[PDB]
Design a protein around this ligand. Structure first.
Ligand SMILES: NC(=O)[C@H]1CCCN(C(=O)[C@@H](CCc2ccccc2)c2ccccc2)C1
Ligand SMILES: [Zn+2]
Length: 140
């Protein structure tokens, strides 16, 4: 579990959005596993605007922040699960690191800000849904 809070936005994994998030929807993309909902209060997160491939992510299954190298956002094959059929997930970055399903929502950060949130994994790999191309998160 976990979310990004920037301005009047809550960014969460689409497969984990609560009923309250759907009743206050801004934008969603099934192919990226992202959903953005409106918030009454202002958030403090700054989104990174860069091409960094090294950062630190939070892993709830180990209660640890791990430094990692990660790939460029890409269309990656994600196996069928209870949340989606077998498909290509876009804007996904992989890293060698421990991750388990309950780790989704963990933030990945670089020196510039929030890069993305855990969305996939397994096999000593962890995948992050990128949010750095969502330039509109920095306005209104
Ligand atoms: N974005 C998605 O479509 C997610 C939805 C939840 C499930 N997804 C994952 O990647 C799972 C592992 C799936 C798996 C298990 C066993 C064998 C082959 C695959 C996972 C593991 C670790 C961290 C986060 C998620 C896909
Ligand atoms: Zn950066």
């Amino acid at each position: 579990s976990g979310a990004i809070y920037v301005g009047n936005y809550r960014v969460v994994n689409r497969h984990l959005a609560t009923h309250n998030d759907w009743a206050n929807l801004v934008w969603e993309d099934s192919s990226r596993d992202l959903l953005v909902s409106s918030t009454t209060a202002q958030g403090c997160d700054t989104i990174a605007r860069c091409d960094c491939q090294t950062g630190v992510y939070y892993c709830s299954s180990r209660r640890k922040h791990y430094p990692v190298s990660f790939s460029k956002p890409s269309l990656i094959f994600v196996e069928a699960s209870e949340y989606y059929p077998a498909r290509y997930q876009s804007h996904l970055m992989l890293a060698v690191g421990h991750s388990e399903p309950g780790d989704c929502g963990g933030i990945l950060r670089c020196q510039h800000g929030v890069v993305g949130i855990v969305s996939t994994g397994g096999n000593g790999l962890v995948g992050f849904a990128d949010v750095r191309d969502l330039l509109w998160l920095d306005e209104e």
